[PDB]
Design a protein around this ligand. Sequence first.
Ligand SMILES: CCCCCCCCCCCCCCCCCC(=O)O[C@@H](COC(=O)CCCCCCCCCCCCCCC)COP(=O)(O)OC[C@H](O)CO
Lengths: 459, 57
Amino acid sequence: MLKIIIPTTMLLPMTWMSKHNMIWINATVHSLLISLISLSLLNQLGENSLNFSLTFFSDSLSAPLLVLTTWLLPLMLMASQSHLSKETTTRKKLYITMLILLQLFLIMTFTATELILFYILFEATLVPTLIIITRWGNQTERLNAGLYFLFYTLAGSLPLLVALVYIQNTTGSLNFLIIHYWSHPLSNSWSNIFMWLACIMAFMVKMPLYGLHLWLPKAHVEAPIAGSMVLAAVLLKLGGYGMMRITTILNPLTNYMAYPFLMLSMWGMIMTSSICLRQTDLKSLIAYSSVSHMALVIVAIMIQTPWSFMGATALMIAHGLTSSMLFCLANTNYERVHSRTMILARGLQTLLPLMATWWLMASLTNLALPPSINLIGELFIITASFSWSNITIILMGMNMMITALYSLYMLITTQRGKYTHHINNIKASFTRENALMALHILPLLLLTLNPKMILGPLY
Amino acid sequence: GWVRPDLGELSKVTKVKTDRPLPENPYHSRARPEPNPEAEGDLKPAKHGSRLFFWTM
Ligand SMILES: CCCCCCCCCCCCCCCCCC(=O)O[C@@H](COC(=O)CCCCCCCCCCCCCCC)COP(=O)(O)OC[C@H](O)CO
């Protein structure tokens, strides 16, 4: 509720009014402090969601994502204070302002009690990210990249706007509790499909499914490090949160209309993971891997099965923490080599031995190696999907088989092998990069002991 | 034994004494539509505020 919001927004005057060089320090202090307070919100009751007021409420689904976003907030500050050191204090302050303003919106939307209120800051997250990708992005095609990312989501979000207000004029309020209790069987009338399509496509776009995913490779690669993590670790997941919330009034229409997306997602994950097997760009390879994992959640959410929701929430968080880490891996390597081609800097393990380890559990976590939370996600989803149909395991398991090859492919090409002779600027890794990397992996294994925290309201 | 009327005398408005009754509706007016009922009762605060989307007040 408020105990998270005002501390987040009151953090903004601090960064603006802090000393010239202390900006990174005091921002990091209370961002971690905010994370601690958010963790206090992680508690949930049995069945009734933790409701605070007409404006804000939390459930067993929102809380794990809330603590994840606040937990993220220190990490971009940690990950960004290397390529922004040679910048004017105002621009550094502006950069920090963008992140916490972005993070502030995330707390708002996840705790939003009204769908329209959920909707207003659903796209409002775009404005800070658009600035981050465009201004501080370090590339040339970032301009076209920002346009692709911006227009795709709007093209899907605006139908939701017309759909959402239609609910208000037809079924009174759009309070999440009032929708759930007063749910009615959506008919099969040919208007209700376009009703169904509008209420779904908005979350489809910013949850890249095959076909509606070309923004993500352009979104991730040209975005700066902080932009890439926030976009891949939370931003691809507003779509996820919407579906678990909005599919309450899409049944039984979801039963019949689910087919085109399920085939698109299940086949897409094989295709996308195949792209990972032959990606020339390390950041792009990680980006395409996010599509495969996210497309798995598409099948998870859209099956509408108790087990499927549970594994979704497991992959909901685990992928986000993992994808942020892998982007950190690529970023921590990038500036040393000043290039994105994977084969540019081979045999890094012989030069940097600890990064060899950090890359190693990172690849293992993305492998869904048990008992990592990723395995709990994928394995739960497979069982739910298998109950839905026996055939899907052929597609399901094949993804894990492909996921194995490309995951260690980056490991062998970069970490193992012969070091590149020509390069000589690879310095011993700063303990900031090392500290940040453990900041990611350590909570992941810490979460393994308590899956019930992140299983969700279906748990 | 008549007399010449003075100026303005002919233009004087005069009261004429008649026996015919005054017409009831010289225009033959029909019935008149009943006005819509007026507002009444003390003004009360708007129930649950603006009631516009998520705005509580
Ligand atoms: C880039 C293109 C879009 C990307 C994909 C987005 C999703 C695809 C479908 C988009 C639908 C947008 C319009 C839906 C608004 C809410 C729909 C809704 O609530 O359902 C109504 C569905 O009714 C409609 O007619 C909704 C619109 C149907 C689709 C036709 C217009 C939308 C498609 C063309 C415009 C957008 C495409 C891009 C154009 C450049 C119910 O009303 P009813 O017809 O049952 O009303 C009672 C009675 O029958 C008479 O009204």
